[PDB]
Write a protein that holds these residues in place. Structure first.
Motif, mmCIF file in Angstrom:
data_model
loop_
_atom_site.group_PDB
_atom_site.id
_atom_site.type_symbol
_atom_site.label_atom_id
_atom_site.label_comp_id
_atom_site.label_asym_id
_atom_site.label_seq_id
_atom_site.Cartn_x
_atom_site.Cartn_y
_atom_site.Cartn_z
ATOM 1 N N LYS A 132 9.918 -18.804 -12.553
ATOM 2 C CA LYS A 132 11.094 -19.439 -11.978
ATOM 3 C C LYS A 132 12.314 -18.535 -12.101
ATOM 4 O O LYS A 132 12.414 -17.710 -13.013
ATOM 5 N N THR A 133 13.233 -18.692 -11.164
ATOM 6 C CA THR A 133 14.510 -17.996 -11.232
ATOM 7 C C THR A 133 15.378 -18.634 -12.309
ATOM 8 O O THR A 133 15.463 -19.864 -12.374
ATOM 9 N N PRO A 134 16.013 -17.846 -13.177
ATOM 10 C CA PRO A 134 16.875 -18.434 -14.209
ATOM 11 C C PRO A 134 17.973 -19.291 -13.595
ATOM 12 O O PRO A 134 18.690 -18.863 -12.688
ATOM 13 N N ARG A 135 18.097 -20.514 -14.105
ATOM 14 C CA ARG A 135 19.059 -21.462 -13.566
ATOM 15 C C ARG A 135 20.485 -21.006 -13.847
ATOM 16 O O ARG A 135 20.779 -20.413 -14.887
ATOM 17 N N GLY A 136 21.371 -21.286 -12.898
ATOM 18 C CA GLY A 136 22.759 -20.876 -13.002
ATOM 19 C C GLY A 136 23.447 -20.730 -11.659
ATOM 20 O O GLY A 136 22.797 -20.565 -10.628
#
Lengths: 213, 135, 99, 22, 82, 62, 132
Positions: free
Chosen positions: G128-132
């Motif tokens: 997953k892409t790091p959330r932010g």
RNA sequence: CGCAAGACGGACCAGAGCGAAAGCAUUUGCCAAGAAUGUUUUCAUUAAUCAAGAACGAAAGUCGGAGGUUCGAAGACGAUCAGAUACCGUCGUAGUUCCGACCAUAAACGAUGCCGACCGGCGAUGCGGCGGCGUUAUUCCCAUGACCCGCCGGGCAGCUUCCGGGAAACCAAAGUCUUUGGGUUCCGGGGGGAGUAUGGUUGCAAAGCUGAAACUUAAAGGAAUUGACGGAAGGGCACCACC
């Protein structure tokens, strides 16, 4: 008509031996006249000088406040009066998705100098972490702060001013705090953010000159 | 009599830049700061109170301070600039950049640059009322 | 009628939020409601970088940065054009502008 | 008239009434 | 999904559900028999023990209470009953 | 006040409330280190070789 | 102020798409094909239609225009569409298959196939892409 | 460069947490609490809502006593203005701080009572528990932290869907309502008069709670639509506009 600088002399203030560079600057003092002596108005002067000007290769964001104590041979002798980080350095590591641990300790050296040390640390996002925030729980924060406090106490109370500043130059205290708190919660930018002198022992020329050993 | 500057070395001073929004203070002192060498503000040049903060007043003040420091021996300067601080605005006025650049163009050597804005830990109440300046 | 589902503030699940003063007019606005901007700017403007660097004692100093967090009320943000009015369909977009 | 200021006028009027029958 | 045989559900789904939400509620807990190297009598222990139960023949503990399942100690071999 | 054959490779266009000010990005011929952006009146076409008279005080804004 | 009105654009595109064989890079050909089939009654109009067909021919050598369709370009595209490669892309000697899809194939009574190659899956389990 | 006084806990600080609500942000210690989770413990209907009654209840206000930095009702000036008695600036009293005793009101708001059941999806996030490749520190397998992938239960929310509802705005509840009944408390009946008068009651006072009528009126109001207007914003154009 008569500018006051025609009645003013220039002294070359000097740093103690623990710094690689000795000459850190000059200073202006008016000439002695009346009850006023050129030295009593010169002892109470503090120079806020970057560390990179006192070490051949070290951080430029660490500042040392050095206070004059006497003037020998038109050379002003300075001792450690404080340590700080620059404003931009502190502001550049307070990010908005991590917790900041701010520990502090009133401690005394074996030679009688009472120092308040402020340590700051910031939690570290792991290299494989997806979660946006890297907060630490309150018990984790307490454990980290307690470890910082005990490390600072054990690293200052066992030493005197000379070796305390010697280990402050590379900030080994911050490295020790980081390696200790890694087991609790990984930390990112740990430094002794500040050191202030609360009370210091009586003035003595012997220890002063022994510092420049 | 005077300084003991060497042939290649440069003696240093500390420049305090008070960049408020009413006028710019250009101050120069010893490395310690205890001895003030020469201080010229933005209001010492122009008589238009609108112009006291304008970049031109900062240019004039910085060039004057550079000339006075050079005639007094100082060749290089350290930079310690501040805003009003306190509970009021934490941003430099319109003359900070202009004064710094005018010092640089006047043949001065710039040393280290620092911000000495007074930043409280949530100090006392701000000047404005509950609703603030309604104009 | 209710213009915003969140009532124009981030307060949710709590009762009271400490206020902060507007950085432009000194108006008390709740912390979650105030429009927050973060400026990490160079101390000298992009024009003056060359003349400061060329007159810098050190070799490749790398210039410091001014970090300021400004809190605005709604009115001062609208006047300062930090944000503006948006259509009803586009008011719901919380995505920050690409810039 | 604003409702708050209308209420203020009514309360002032009530204070005058309290005063007159002291 | 508009047609779900609630009478006979998947064993995986019933193991997934809460202990109460299942068709017939069953606990997620179990009883083990723990053997210590130096003792020859078996001691039954609840999986989610709330107390520090000690072994009479050994100086070591059998399990630490926790927020959930008890923390069994290394050196004791567990075998779940039933 | 350097003097050189400035090789212009960046002319963006005109801007200003009088519409005669073109923003030319003076680049030095064989430097590839520094460039200056200036608001100047007159037709300064793309690719021309400017006469270098001044290398500071760029186009002022605000 | 030289935007071609839809009259010019439609006339030019129709003329080009219809009788492109007679149309090269000129004007009198366009006026002739007009006066033959779809006559236009003015002169500035014929000049502007000739100019637009010239521009469209300049843009049509580099590639097919969106609004036009010649028999030539349609022919080339349908030959490209009818392309039958000599060797199929799905005719691989060996096909890499993860252990999970391998087990799936085994459950489908397709585990005895020899054209598969069990490939070791990803060491980690982050996607997953790091959330932010 | 020091000393002192009072204030307040910036950045971290979030559509995050806790609290019944008001509200709560420096450390450390002590004191008593509390939700949730875990539980093959225990009691065994002990429960839900709730007249009377009770506890708590922002700010301002009151009384008594300490304190008094800053801010600042009143007020004094100085500007703006036709005039400002305001907005703006310099001061400046009560107050703004702590203690004790009052008060019991807020757009005290989610303008949405509580308990219970049922009715879609998805991604997150706070707490606890459970399982599981792998990386990382504790220089040791396993614990355990820090991450990663899921599962379960409460929680603050978010996106999406004609579940359904609604006058609509909108609401996964504001749905399961003419196919109208799970339990229960409070409360509204066109707009004004008016939350006024009066009586009672509470309070030192301010005022709080309960609270009309005569009379007057054909509408007041809610949501949405089009246009017009804006000393609202963003683009574009005009020598009957400007430069």
């Amino acid at each position: 008509v008569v500018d006051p600088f025609s009645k003013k002399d220039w002294y070359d203030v000097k740093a103690p031996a623990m710094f690689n560079i000795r000459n850190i600057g000059k200073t202006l003092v008016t000439r002695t006249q009346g009850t006023k002596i050129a030295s009593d108005g010169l002892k109470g002067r503090v120079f806020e000088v970057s560390l990179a000007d006192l070490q051949n290769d070290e951080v430029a964001f660490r500042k040392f406040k050095l206070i004059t104590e006497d003037v020998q041979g038109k050379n002003c002798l300075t001792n450690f009066h404080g340590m700080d980080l620059t404003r931009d350095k502190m502001c550049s590591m307070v990010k908005k998705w991590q917790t900041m641990i701010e520990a502090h300790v009133d401690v005394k050296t074996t030679d009688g100098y009472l120092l308040r040390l402020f340590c700051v640390g910031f939690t570290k996002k792991r290299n494989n972490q997806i979660r946006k925030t890297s907060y630490a729980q309150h018990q984790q924060v307490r454990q980290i702060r307690k470890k910082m406090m005990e490390i600072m106490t054990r690293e200052v109370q066992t030493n005197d001013l000379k070796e305390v500043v010697n280990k402050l130059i590379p900030d080994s205290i911050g490295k020790d705090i980081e390696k200790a708190c890694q087991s609790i919660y990984p930390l990112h930018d740990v430094f002794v953010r500040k050191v202030k002198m609360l009370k210091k022992p009586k003035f003595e020329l012997g220890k002063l000159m022994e510092l420049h050993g | 009599l005077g300084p003991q500057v060497a042939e290649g070395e440069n003696v240093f001073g500390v420049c305090h830049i008070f960049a408020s929004f009413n006028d710019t203070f250009v101050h120069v002192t010893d490395l310690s700061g205890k001895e003030t060498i020469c201080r010229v503000t933005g209001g010492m040049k122009v008589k238009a109170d609108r112009d006291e903060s304008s970049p031109y007043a900062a240019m004039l003040a910085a060039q004057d301070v550079a000339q006075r420091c050079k005639e007094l021996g100082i060749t290089a300067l350290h930079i310690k600039l501040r805003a009003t601080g306190g509970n009021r605005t934490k941003t430099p006025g319109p003359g900070a950049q202009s004064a710094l650049r005018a010092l640089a163009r006047s043949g001065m050597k710039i040393g280290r640059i620092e911000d000495v804005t007074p930043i409280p830990s949530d100090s006392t109440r701000r000047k404005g009322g509950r609703r603030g300046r309604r104009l | 009628t209710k213009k915003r589902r969140n009532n124009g503030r981030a307060k949710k699940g709590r009762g009271h939020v400490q206020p902060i003063r507007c950085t432009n007019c000194a108006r008390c606005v709740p912390k979650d409601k105030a429009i927050k901007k973060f400026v990490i700017r160079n101390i000298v403007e992009a024009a003056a970088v060359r003349d400061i660097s060329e007159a810098s004692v050190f070799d490749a100093y790398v210039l410091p940065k001014l970090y300021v967090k400004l809190h605005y009320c709604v009115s001062c943000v609208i006047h300062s054009k930090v944000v503006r009015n948006r259509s009803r369909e586009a008011r719901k977009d919380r995505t920050p502008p690409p810039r | 008239m604003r409702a708050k200021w209308r209420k203020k006028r009514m309360r002032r009027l009530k204070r005058k009434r309290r005063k007159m029958r002291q | 999904p508009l047609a779900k045989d609630l009478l006979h559900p998947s064993p995986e789904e019933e193991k997934r559900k809460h202990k109460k939400k299942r068709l017939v509620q069953s606990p997620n807990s179990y009883f083990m028999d723990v053997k210590c190297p130096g003792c020859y009598k078996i001691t039954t222990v609840f999986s989610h023990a709330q107390t520090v139960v000690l072994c009479v023949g050994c100086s070591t503990v059998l399990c630490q209470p926790t927020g959930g399942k008890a923390r069994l100690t290394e050196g004791c071999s567990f075998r779940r009953k039933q | 006040q350097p003097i050189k054959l400035a090789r212009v490779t960046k002319v963006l266009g005109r801007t200003g409330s009088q519409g005669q000010c073109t923003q030319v990005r003076v680049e030095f011929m064989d430097d590839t280190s520094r460039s200056i952006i200036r608001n100047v009146k007159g037709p300064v076409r793309e690719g021309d070789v400017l006469t270098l008279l001044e290398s500071e005080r760029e186009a002022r804004r605000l | 102020g030289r935007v071609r009105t839809k009259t010019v654009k439609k006339a030019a595109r129709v003329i080009i798409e219809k009788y492109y064989t007679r149309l090269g890079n000129d004007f009198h050909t366009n006026k002739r094909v007009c006066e033959e089939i779809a006559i236009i009654p003015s002169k500035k109009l014929r000049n502007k239609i000739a100019g637009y067909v010239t521009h469209l021919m300049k843009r049509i050598q580099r590639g097919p225009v969106r609004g036009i369709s010649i028999k030539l370009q349609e022919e080339e595209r349908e030959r490209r569409d009818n392309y039958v490669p000599e060797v199929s892309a799905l005719d691989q000697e060996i096909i890499e298959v993860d252990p999970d899809t391998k087990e799936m194939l085994k459950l489908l009574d397709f585990g005895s196939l020899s054209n598969l190659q069990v490939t070791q899956p990803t060491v980690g389990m982050n996607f997953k892409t790091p959330r932010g």
